[PDB]
CSV table of C-alpha atoms in Angstrom, one decimal:
chain,number,residue,atom,x,y,z
J,1,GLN,CA,-125.6,-77.7,-25.6
J,2,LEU,CA,-126.3,-73.9,-25.4
J,3,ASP,CA,-127.6,-71.8,-28.3
J,4,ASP,CA,-124.7,-69.3,-27.8
J,5,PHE,CA,-125.2,-68.1,-31.4
J,6,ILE,CA,-128.4,-66.0,-30.6
J,7,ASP,CA,-129.2,-62.3,-30.1
J,8,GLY,CA,-132.1,-63.0,-27.7
J,9,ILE,CA,-135.1,-65.2,-26.8
J,10,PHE,CA,-138.8,-64.7,-27.7
V,12,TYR,CA,-140.1,-62.0,-49.7
V,13,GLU,CA,-140.4,-65.6,-48.3
V,14,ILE,CA,-139.8,-67.1,-44.8
V,15,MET,CA,-138.3,-70.6,-45.2
V,16,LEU,CA,-139.1,-73.4,-42.8
V,17,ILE,CA,-136.5,-76.3,-42.3
V,18,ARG,CA,-135.3,-78.9,-39.9
V,19,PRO,CA,-131.7,-79.4,-41.1
V,20,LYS,CA,-130.3,-83.0,-41.3
V,21,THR,CA,-127.2,-82.7,-43.4
V,22,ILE,CA,-124.4,-80.2,-44.3
V,23,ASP,CA,-126.3,-79.4,-47.6
V,24,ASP,CA,-129.2,-78.2,-45.4
V,25,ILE,CA,-126.9,-76.0,-43.4
V,26,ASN,CA,-125.5,-74.5,-46.7
V,27,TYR,CA,-129.2,-74.1,-47.8
V,28,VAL,CA,-129.8,-71.8,-44.8
V,29,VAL,CA,-126.6,-69.8,-45.4
V,30,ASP,CA,-127.7,-69.2,-49.0
V,31,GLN,CA,-131.4,-68.2,-48.1
V,32,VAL,CA,-130.2,-65.6,-45.5
V,33,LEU,CA,-127.2,-64.3,-47.5
V,34,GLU,CA,-128.1,-64.7,-51.2
V,35,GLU,CA,-132.0,-64.6,-51.2
V,36,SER,CA,-132.3,-62.3,-48.1
V,37,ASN,CA,-135.1,-64.6,-46.9
V,38,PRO,CA,-135.6,-65.2,-43.1
V,39,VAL,CA,-135.4,-68.9,-42.1
V,40,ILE,CA,-137.2,-70.6,-39.3
V,41,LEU,CA,-135.2,-73.7,-38.5
V,42,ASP,CA,-135.4,-76.5,-36.0
V,43,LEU,CA,-131.9,-77.6,-34.9
V,44,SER,CA,-133.2,-80.6,-32.9
V,45,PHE,CA,-132.2,-83.2,-35.5
V,46,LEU,CA,-128.6,-82.0,-35.7
V,47,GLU,CA,-128.4,-81.6,-31.9
V,48,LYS,CA,-129.1,-85.2,-31.2
V,49,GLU,CA,-127.8,-86.9,-34.4
V,50,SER,CA,-124.7,-84.9,-35.3
V,51,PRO,CA,-123.1,-82.8,-32.5
V,52,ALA,CA,-120.4,-81.9,-35.1
V,53,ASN,CA,-122.9,-80.5,-37.6
V,54,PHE,CA,-124.9,-78.7,-34.8
V,55,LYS,CA,-121.6,-76.9,-33.8
V,56,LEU,CA,-121.0,-76.2,-37.5
V,57,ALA,CA,-124.6,-74.8,-37.9
V,58,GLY,CA,-124.0,-72.5,-34.9
V,59,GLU,CA,-120.7,-71.3,-36.2
V,60,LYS,CA,-122.4,-70.3,-39.5
V,61,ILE,CA,-125.1,-68.3,-37.5
V,62,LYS,CA,-122.3,-66.6,-35.5
V,63,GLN,CA,-120.5,-65.6,-38.8
V,64,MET,CA,-123.8,-64.4,-40.4
V,65,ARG,CA,-124.6,-62.1,-37.4
V,66,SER,CA,-121.0,-60.9,-37.0
V,67,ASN,CA,-120.2,-60.1,-40.6
V,68,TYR,CA,-123.5,-59.7,-42.4
V,69,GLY,CA,-125.9,-58.1,-39.9
V,70,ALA,CA,-128.3,-61.1,-39.5
V,71,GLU,CA,-130.4,-61.3,-36.3
V,72,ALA,CA,-131.1,-64.7,-34.7
V,73,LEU,CA,-133.7,-65.4,-32.1
V,74,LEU,CA,-134.6,-68.5,-30.1
V,75,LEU,CA,-138.3,-69.0,-30.3
V,76,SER,CA,-138.8,-72.4,-28.6
V,77,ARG,CA,-136.8,-75.0,-26.8
V,78,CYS,CA,-138.3,-78.3,-25.6
V,79,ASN,CA,-137.8,-82.2,-26.0
V,80,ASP,CA,-137.5,-82.7,-29.8
V,81,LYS,CA,-137.5,-79.0,-30.7
V,82,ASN,CA,-134.9,-76.1,-30.8
V,83,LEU,CA,-136.6,-73.4,-32.9
V,84,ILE,CA,-134.5,-70.6,-34.2
V,85,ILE,CA,-135.4,-67.7,-36.5
V,86,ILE,CA,-132.6,-66.1,-38.6
V,87,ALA,CA,-133.5,-62.7,-40.2
V,88,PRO,CA,-131.2,-61.2,-42.8
V,89,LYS,CA,-129.9,-57.5,-42.8
V,90,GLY,CA,-133.1,-55.8,-44.1
V,91,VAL,CA,-135.7,-57.7,-42.1
V,92,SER,CA,-136.0,-56.5,-38.5
V,93,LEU,CA,-137.2,-58.8,-35.6
V,94,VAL,CA,-139.2,-56.4,-33.6
V,95,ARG,CA,-140.1,-57.4,-30.0
V,96,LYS,CA,-143.4,-55.9,-28.9
Y,12,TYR,CA,-140.3,-55.4,-44.0
Y,13,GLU,CA,-140.4,-56.4,-40.2
Y,14,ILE,CA,-141.5,-59.5,-38.3
Y,15,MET,CA,-143.3,-58.5,-35.1
Y,16,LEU,CA,-143.0,-60.6,-31.9
Y,17,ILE,CA,-145.8,-60.4,-29.3
Y,18,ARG,CA,-147.6,-62.3,-26.5
Y,19,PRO,CA,-151.1,-60.8,-26.6
Y,20,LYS,CA,-152.7,-60.0,-23.2
Y,21,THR,CA,-155.6,-57.6,-24.1
Y,22,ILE,CA,-158.0,-56.9,-27.0
Y,23,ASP,CA,-155.8,-53.9,-28.0
Y,24,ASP,CA,-152.9,-56.4,-28.6
Y,25,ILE,CA,-155.3,-58.5,-30.8
Y,26,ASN,CA,-156.1,-55.3,-32.8
Y,27,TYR,CA,-152.4,-54.6,-33.0
Y,28,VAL,CA,-151.8,-58.0,-34.7
Y,29,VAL,CA,-154.8,-57.4,-37.1
Y,30,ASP,CA,-153.2,-54.0,-38.1
Y,31,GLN,CA,-149.6,-55.4,-38.6
Y,32,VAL,CA,-150.8,-58.2,-40.9
Y,33,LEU,CA,-153.4,-56.2,-42.8
Y,34,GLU,CA,-152.2,-52.5,-42.8
Y,35,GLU,CA,-148.4,-52.9,-42.5
Y,36,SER,CA,-148.2,-56.3,-44.3
Y,37,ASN,CA,-145.8,-57.4,-41.6
Y,38,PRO,CA,-145.6,-61.1,-40.4
Y,39,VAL,CA,-146.4,-61.5,-36.7
Y,40,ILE,CA,-144.9,-64.3,-34.5
Y,41,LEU,CA,-147.4,-64.4,-31.5
Y,42,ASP,CA,-147.6,-66.5,-28.4
Y,43,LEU,CA,-151.3,-67.2,-27.5
Y,44,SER,CA,-150.5,-68.8,-24.2
Y,45,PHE,CA,-151.5,-65.8,-22.0
Y,46,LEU,CA,-154.9,-65.4,-23.7
Y,47,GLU,CA,-155.5,-69.2,-23.6
Y,48,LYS,CA,-155.1,-69.5,-19.8
Y,49,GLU,CA,-156.2,-65.9,-18.7
Y,50,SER,CA,-159.1,-65.1,-21.1
Y,51,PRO,CA,-160.7,-67.9,-23.0
Y,52,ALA,CA,-163.1,-65.3,-24.5
Y,53,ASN,CA,-160.2,-63.3,-26.0
Y,54,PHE,CA,-158.4,-66.5,-27.1
Y,55,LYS,CA,-161.6,-67.4,-29.1
Y,56,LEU,CA,-161.7,-63.8,-30.4
Y,57,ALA,CA,-158.0,-63.9,-31.5
Y,58,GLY,CA,-158.7,-67.2,-33.4
Y,59,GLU,CA,-161.7,-65.7,-35.1
Y,60,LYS,CA,-159.6,-62.8,-36.3
Y,61,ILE,CA,-157.0,-65.2,-37.7
Y,62,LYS,CA,-159.7,-67.2,-39.5
Y,63,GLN,CA,-161.1,-63.9,-41.1
Y,64,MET,CA,-157.6,-62.8,-42.1
Y,65,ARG,CA,-156.9,-66.1,-43.9
Y,66,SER,CA,-160.4,-66.4,-45.4
Y,67,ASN,CA,-160.8,-62.8,-46.8
Y,68,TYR,CA,-157.2,-61.4,-47.0
Y,69,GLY,CA,-155.0,-64.4,-48.0
Y,70,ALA,CA,-153.0,-64.6,-44.8
Y,71,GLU,CA,-151.2,-67.9,-44.0
Y,72,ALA,CA,-151.0,-69.1,-40.3
Y,73,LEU,CA,-148.7,-71.8,-39.0
Y,74,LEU,CA,-148.3,-73.4,-35.6
Y,75,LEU,CA,-144.6,-73.4,-34.7
Y,76,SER,CA,-144.6,-74.7,-31.1
Y,77,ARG,CA,-147.1,-75.9,-28.5
Y,78,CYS,CA,-146.0,-76.8,-25.0
Y,79,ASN,CA,-146.8,-75.8,-21.3
Y,80,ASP,CA,-146.8,-71.9,-21.3
Y,81,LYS,CA,-146.3,-71.6,-25.1
Y,82,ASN,CA,-148.6,-71.6,-28.1
Y,83,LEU,CA,-146.5,-70.1,-30.9
Y,84,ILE,CA,-148.2,-69.1,-34.1
Y,85,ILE,CA,-146.8,-67.2,-37.2
Y,86,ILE,CA,-149.2,-65.1,-39.3
Y,87,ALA,CA,-147.8,-64.1,-42.7
Y,88,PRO,CA,-149.7,-61.6,-44.8
Y,89,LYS,CA,-150.6,-62.0,-48.5
Y,90,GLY,CA,-147.2,-61.2,-50.1
Y,91,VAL,CA,-145.0,-63.2,-47.7
Y,92,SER,CA,-145.0,-66.9,-48.4
Y,93,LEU,CA,-144.3,-69.5,-45.6
Y,94,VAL,CA,-142.3,-72.1,-47.6
Y,95,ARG,CA,-141.9,-75.5,-46.0
Y,96,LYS,CA,-138.6,-77.1,-46.9
G,1,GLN,CA,-158.6,-75.7,-26.9
G,2,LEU,CA,-157.5,-76.5,-30.5
G,3,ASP,CA,-155.7,-74.1,-32.8
G,4,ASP,CA,-158.5,-74.6,-35.5
G,5,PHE,CA,-157.4,-71.3,-37.2
G,6,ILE,CA,-154.2,-72.7,-38.8
G,7,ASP,CA,-153.1,-73.7,-42.3
G,8,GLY,CA,-150.5,-76.2,-41.0
G,9,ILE,CA,-147.9,-77.1,-38.4
G,10,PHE,CA,-144.1,-76.6,-38.6
């Protein structure tokens, strides 16, 4: 279940 | 402005986040862990809403933390920059 | 405004956070894990700075996530409300 | 090493 809705990771 | 903090459980909570980002222009820090393990259908729905917000309204979304029982995301509207330093 | 994102490593990074919150009135999302395991003296110093900001300047501070290699804190200045929902 | 400088937890 990837978070394929993000523009990057902290 | 305000930064809202929520752990969505229902579709009404997903619509709440859409409205804070798009109508109030408030960033939202949200934990998607409840939707992820309780409703895979609403977790996919929540993610589709975030994709549409970034694609059409210039929202930024960042993953802040991902462990057992936590999936922390921050959604900033167009007008609030997330600046990596 | 802007929300700054940082993992402090030195005293200059601690002064950077003081200046964003107090001079720029920008919220800061900071990971204190590096200071915690590398410099216990600068971790205590960072915490003292956050106590002074909240006590004298009306800043709010919230713990967002705490696991191995992460200690995520958000500091909002007076003027940006962290609203639990 | 407590985070005794916070006003609450998410």
